Amino acid sequence: EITYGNEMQDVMPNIFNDRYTSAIYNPIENLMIFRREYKASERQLKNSL
Amino acid sequence: NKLITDLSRVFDYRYVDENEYNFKLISDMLTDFNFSLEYHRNKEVFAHNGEQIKYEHLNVTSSVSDFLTYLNGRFSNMVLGHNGDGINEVKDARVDNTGYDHKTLQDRLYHDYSTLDAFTKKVEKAVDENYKEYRATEYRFEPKEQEPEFITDLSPYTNAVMQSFWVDPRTKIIYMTQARPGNHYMLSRLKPNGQFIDRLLVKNGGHGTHNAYRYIGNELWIYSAVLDANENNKFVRFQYRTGEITYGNEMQDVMPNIFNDRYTSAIYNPIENLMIFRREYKASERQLKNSLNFVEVRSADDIDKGIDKVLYQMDIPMEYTSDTQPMQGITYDAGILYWYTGDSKPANPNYLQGFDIKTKELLFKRRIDIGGVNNNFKGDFQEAEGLDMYYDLETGRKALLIGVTIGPGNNRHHSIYSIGQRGVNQFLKNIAPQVSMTDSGGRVKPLPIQNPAYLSDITEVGHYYIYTQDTQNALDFPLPKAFRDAGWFFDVLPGHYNGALRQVLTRNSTGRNMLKFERVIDIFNKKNNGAWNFCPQNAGYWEHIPKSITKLSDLKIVGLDFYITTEESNRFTDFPKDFKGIAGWILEVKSNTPGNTTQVLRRNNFPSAHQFLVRNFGTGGVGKWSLFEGKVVE
Amino acid sequence: DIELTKKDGTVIKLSEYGFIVNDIVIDSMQINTKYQDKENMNGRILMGSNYISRDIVVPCFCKVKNRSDIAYMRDMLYSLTTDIEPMYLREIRRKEELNYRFTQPTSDDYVKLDKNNFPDYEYSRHDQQIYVNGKQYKVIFNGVINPKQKGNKVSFELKFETTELPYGESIGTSLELEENKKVGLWSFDFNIDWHAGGDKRKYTFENLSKGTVYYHGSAPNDQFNMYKKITIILGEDTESFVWNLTHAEIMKIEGIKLKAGDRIVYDSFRVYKNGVEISTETNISQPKFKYGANKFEFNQTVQKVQFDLKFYYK
Amino acid sequence: DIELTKKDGTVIKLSEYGFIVNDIVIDSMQINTKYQDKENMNGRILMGSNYISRDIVVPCFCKVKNRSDIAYMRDMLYSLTTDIEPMYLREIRRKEELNYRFTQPTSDDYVKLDKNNFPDYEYSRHDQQIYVNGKQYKVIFNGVINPKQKGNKVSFELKFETTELPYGESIGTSLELEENKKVGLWSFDFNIDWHAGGDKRKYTFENLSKGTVYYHGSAPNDQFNMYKKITIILGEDTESFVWNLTHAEIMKIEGIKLKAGDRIVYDSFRVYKNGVEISTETNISQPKFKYGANKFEFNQTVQKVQFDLKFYYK
Structure with missing residues (x-):
């Protein structure tokens, strides 16, 4: 078992812990592709999730 | 024409219109200023x-x-x-x-x-x-000299020697860390004068010889040296609250891969925004380095994010960290590291030694008789304690201040001295006054609450007065709701070093007896508060039973005087049926096993023979009135 | 101008469904009087006077891309609105009569168009409409006709009507005022102080014989249908239990013996002695909060009182 | 043009609340007749004729700075006015159709603007409006609709109605006329002599068998609901006590024995023999002041009579 706390360390929280976020990793290019969701209010204008 | 920085406190159309007009005005004023500057620069x-x-x-x-x-x-x-x-x-x-x-x-x-x-x-x-010369006389800060000045005295509810002492310049509140009998420790947050406010028990912390107190923003974080249940030291970040706290996910760590090898404890300096860590040495390299401890500096931003950047590193020789003079305090200011050491007895004199960190030298060291004057302390216990640097945000004048304990045995004193500049010690004392039985002029003090429910809520020592209307609620009152009619001089007196306090309540009435009750309370465990003792305190006046004339069994209180006329006696039930209405009667109470209590009743007849009849009622049973009659003689 | 409807099991808003609205007009409450005329006296006695019903009217039209679709759209409207099911209506307004903003005719910065063929003046997030107030209305529909003006534009004239009580039921209890957890549902129409935990926000008192309450609602909460609900930990044992209140009647609970730690849930005209098995024979009297200061007076210093209620408006 | 309302516990005026009004129009009193037509006779008998109700109408509109605020403002209006609670309305007028005055366009003497975006023509203290008359009306509200003309302007059509008695209740008693203590509340609609202490101001006589009264009210104070209240120190012992009066009926008090220094409080259709324990069995007849001279005639020279009342108008 695990849960957020001493055993887990965030990464630059202040900059993208305002909306739901997930990631994948491509090691060939050494890239971290971040999927980042939208809020409902922004979505109303963006027409996208 | 100008802004409204006095916003309505009811959240209505007025408030919304003020905010809207405020933004409209800001936009208008700004574009006007821009146009004005452009006119100035081009055509004026x-x-x-x-x-x-x-x-x-x-x-x-x-x-x-x-x-x-x-x-x-x-x-x-x-x-x-x-x-x-x-x-x-x-x-x-x-x-x-x-x-x-x-x-x-x-x-x-x-x-x-x-x-x-x-x-x-x-x-x-x-x-x-x-x-x-004017600067050196005005902003003088020379802890080589500058004999100290008392600041205040501390009143925590713990019978242990204090071990660290920090002041909050943003709110003028003290945080005071003592090490409890176990490994665990407790930090008490309290008032500038010394009035306790609340506490936090860090369960499974160390000696906690000093924490660091940081204001990242508008909130106070606390860095400490807490060891988990597996006896592994850890540099851990958390927030203050009232009660208890254990190591866990409630308190996150800043940098585990760097600050979990050795016992490390920090202190923070906001003037230059640095943090010095006093990391211990293991017994292996102990004799190799000839120093129990080493200090390493890091910037606040570097320690917040993931970079070490040890700017300055120094060791503490055994000359400073000996057993006769062990570590008690550390403080940083202007690259001058101050080390306060002192034995637990006045024979081995304490020492405050300041020295530059950049060069790893010895700038100075001095002896200082803190606490009892002339080395004549309360008994013989000058157990030293750390020290810090209060930086007032108003003037910008730093001020060193040190803690000391001069108390003998279990009785511990907690005194504070300072080497501050001109205008800081005065301010620190004049924040708020010390406690006193009377406010300042010889008047009673005020309750913290009107019409109090539990009289144990009043922790602040001193005298008080409960109005007759405020007594009505009083869930823990020596008397019932029917007996109280007048006010009560109610005074709280100090108990012992745990959370105890004595209480006394003396009725206010000139035309009758000023009876007094007395007890003990425990602020933490309200259930552990004693019952209401009673002293006689008579004047020859008389007390009458109120309309609660149902039974004489409700009068369990000890050693009182209650008159019962003939008309009064012709209501009660426990009163015998032979002497009902024949003369007046004086009632008295005597103690017994709990529930059980003796009631004596004495006739009031001058010419005829005297009579007195005694009863015992309570847990053992109802009780039968046994009479004794007198022989008229002269 | 959206006419939100919260039904038992869902939430709907018209402009989401291609249904613009022209406006919303809310009548006041039909005061039914009860006069009695004395036979030969120049004046008539007031037996009573009483609010009845708050008839709402909302004309809404709709445009579509083709003439056939009108039918579908109309049916949707009926299936979406005409509900005997008592619904909760919430009104919406705009903060501004929005216009199209300046642009640049350089084969760029062109204009947008909604799903319906209209010009999107709502460029930014902060353009669209708002729940103008933190209240609702218990509402039912009445008959509509659908005149079709030209093209794909057709109008409708909804005639809504209050269901139970002609009042502006405030959404959210008074405890959400206490605990500032839920956000929204608190408009400036209610003159509410920011001092959360201060007076005139608190409905959770402890260890008091007497205390103070500020009922922010202009309309009086005497009617039982309103969700006035009290719960008290009595603090002290007793055989009888009286509590008085102003802008209301006296209340007794006699004839049943209680205990201190036992709690009473005092619902409207109803008394749970200990949460169930209602013992409501004692002095059937219901309390009434009118507006502003509603001072209560207990008799033996209850260790806890707290009560949630709903604010109602006229 | 402010439409003041004194409610049970407060005072309100609309223009204080951003609510201008167009006008106030006060209908007369609906005369309900009671005729009876004889079967074959060219004429119908009058059984009776009687005033009923004085329906007031007041259309008021309001401007605000933004479209949203309309809602708030409207709700305020309802919460402020629509009260089954019998209120006391007072009418207000202006003394002049005020204009903006001359100024100087020299970057100085600029014009003012009210909290609402309007031009303040009220430069001096003596510009603003006045209680046009020293009377009120017992009043209740009836249904309103709120058409929103363009912008932030919205109109309303208040329809008020008399509560108990269709009359213009004069504020302040007749003793405030006697003792010139309270100021205001006396308009020139009432033809009142300045000779305070002189005749036709005094309702406090001493040691008289017969005396004179000028009831300044056009409408007659025969109805008991009006606050006609007499109190007399009887002056001389007796067994019976008659007093007569014109524009009214004879009054007796027989069958109960009195004393001189004892006082009678003679309220409408009610008799306190000595302030409490009403002895009102004797000749239940209530007195009636019509207008102008209302001469009374006692029978044994009461040492004091004085009586306060309220003037009513049609």
Whole structure:
């Protein structure tokens, strides 16, 4: 078992812990592709999730 | 025309309109300022006065108006200025303005200008010296000297020697860390004078000889040295709250891969925004380094994010960290590290030693008799304690302040001294006054709550007065709701070093007896509060039973006087049926096992024979009144 | 101008469904009087006077891309609105009569168009409409006709009507006022102080014989249908239990013996002695909060009182 | 043009609340007749005729700074006015159709603007409006609709109605006329002599068998609901006590024995023999002041009579 706390360390929280976020990793290019969701209010204008 | 920085506190149309008008005005005022500057810069005639603008030649500064007037004066002089005998003019100008004829005009000019420059530089050196002397007298901070000044005294509810002591310049509150009998420790947050406020028990913390208290923003984080249940030290970040706290996900760590090898504890300095960590050495490299501890500096931003950047590293020799003089305190200011050590007895004199960190030297060390004067402490226990640097945000004047304990045995004193500059110690004392039985002039003090429910809520020692209307609620009152009619002088007295406090309540009434009750309370476990003892305190006056004349069994209180007339006696139930209404009666109570209690009742007849009948009622049973009659004699 | 409807099991808003609205007009409450005329006296006695119904009217039209679709759209409207099911209506307004903003005719910065063929003046997030107030209305529909003006534009004239009580039921209890957890549902129409935990926000008192309450609602909460609900930990044992209140009647609970730690849930005209098995024989009297200061007076210093209620408006 | 309302516990005026009004129009009193037509006779008998109700109408509109705020403002209006609670309305007028005055366009003497975006023509203290008359009306509200004309302007049409008695209740008693203590509340609509202490101001007589009264009210104070209240120190002992009066009926008090220094409080259709324990069995007849001279005639020279009442108008 695990849960957020001493055993887990965030990464630059202040900059993208305002909306739901997930990631994948491509090691060939050494890239971290971040999927980042939208809020409902922004979505109303963006027409996208 | 101007903003409204006084916003409505009810959240209505007025508030919304104020906010809207405020933003509209800000936009209007800003665009007006922009247009005004643009008009100034492009089209405003005579925008600037000519004296303002600077004309900088080589190594020369002057305005434009002055320069233009000088050009015009040159032209005017060259045109309409009379001339002639220039050689004689020069040979006469060779003389100076005191009566000495130089050899050449250039040498004369040189001598004159050098004289002026020397006089001005002498004046300037005198000015700089005078200013520096004024600064060194005003903002003087020389902990080599500057005998200390008392600040305040601490009143935590714990019978253990204090071990660290921090002050919060943003709210003037003290955080005071003691090490409990176990490994765990507790930090008490309390008032500037010393009035306890609340506590936090760090379960499974260490000795906790010093934490660091940081204001990342508008909130206070606490860095400490807490060891988990597996006896592994950890540098851990958390927040204050009232109660208990254990190591876990409630308190996150800043940098586990760096600050979990050794016992590390930090202190923070916001002037330059640094953090020095006093990391211990293991027994293996102990003798190799000849130092139990080493201090390492890191910037606040570096320690917040993931970079070490040890700026400055130093070790603490055994000369400073011996057993006769062990570590008790650390403090950082202006690259000067202060180390406060002191034995637990006044025989081995304490020592405060300050020294530069950059060069790893010894700037100074001094002995200081903190606490009892003349080395005559309360008993013999000068157990030292750390120290910190209060930086007032109003003036910007740092002030060192040290904690000490002079108390003997279990009785521990907690005194605070300071080496601050001019204007800090005065301010720290004048924040709020010490406690006292009377406020300042010989009046009663005020309750913290009107119409209190539990009389144990009043923790602050001193005298108080409960109005007759405020007594009505009083869930824990010695008397019932029916007996209380008048006010009560209610005074809280100090208990012991745990959360105890005595209480006394004396009725207020001139035309009757001023009975008093007494008890003990425990602020934490309200259930552990004693019952209401009673002292007689009679004056010859009398007390009558109120309309609660149902039974005499409700009068369980000890040693009282209650009259019962004939008319009064012809209501009660427990009162016997033979003497109902024959004369007046005085009731008295005597103690027994709990629930059980004796009631004596004495007739009031002058000519006839006296009678008194005694009963015992309670847990053992109802009780049967046994009479005793007297023999009229003279 | 959206006419939100919260039904038992869902939430709907018209402009989401291609249904613009022209406006919303809300009548006041039909005061039914009860006068009695004395036979030969120049004046008539007031037996009573009483609010009845708050008839709402909302004309809404709709445009579509083709004439056939009108039918579908109309049916949707009926299936979406005409509900005997008592619904909760919430009104919406705009903060501004929005216009199209300046742009640049340089083959760029062109204009947008909604799903319906209209010009999107709502460029930014902060353009669209708002729940103008933190209240609702218990509402039912009445008959509509659908005149079709030209093209794909057709109008409708909804005539809504209050269901139970002609009042502006405030959404959210008074405890959400206490605990500032839920966000929204608190408009400036209610003159509410920011001092959360201060007076005139708190409905959770402890260890008091008497205390103070600020009922922010202009309309009085005397009617039982309103969700006035009290719960008290009595603090002290007793055999009888009286509590008085102003802008209301006296209340007794006699004839049943209680205990201190036992709690009473005092619902409207109803008394749970201990949460169930209602013992409501004692002095059937219901309390009434009118507006502003509603001072109560207990008799033996209850260790806890707290009560949630709903604010109602006229 | 402010439409003041004194409610049970407060005072309100609309223009204080951003609510201008267009006008106030006060209908007369609906005369309900009671005729009876004889079967074959060219004429119908009058059984009776009687005033009923004085329906007031007041259309008021309001401007605000933004469209949203309309809602708030409207709700305020309802919460402020629509009160079954019998209120006391007072009408207000202006003394002049005020204009903006001359000024100077020299970057100075600029014009003012009210909290609402309007031009303040009320430069001096003596510009603003006045209680046009020293009377009120017992009033209740009836249904309103709120058409929103453009912008932030919205109109309303208040329809008020008399509560108990269709009359213009005069504020302040007749003793405030006697003792010139309270100021205001006396308009020139009432033809009142300045000779305070003189005749036709005094309702406090001493040691008289018969005396004179000027009831300044056009409408007659025969109805008991009006606050006609007499109190008399009887002056002389007796067994019976008659007093007569014109524009009214005879009054007796027989069958109960009195004393001189004892006082009678003679309220409308009610008799306190000595302030309490009403002895009102004797000749239940109530007195009636019509207008102008209302001469009374006692029978044994009461040492004091004085009586306060309220003037009513039609």
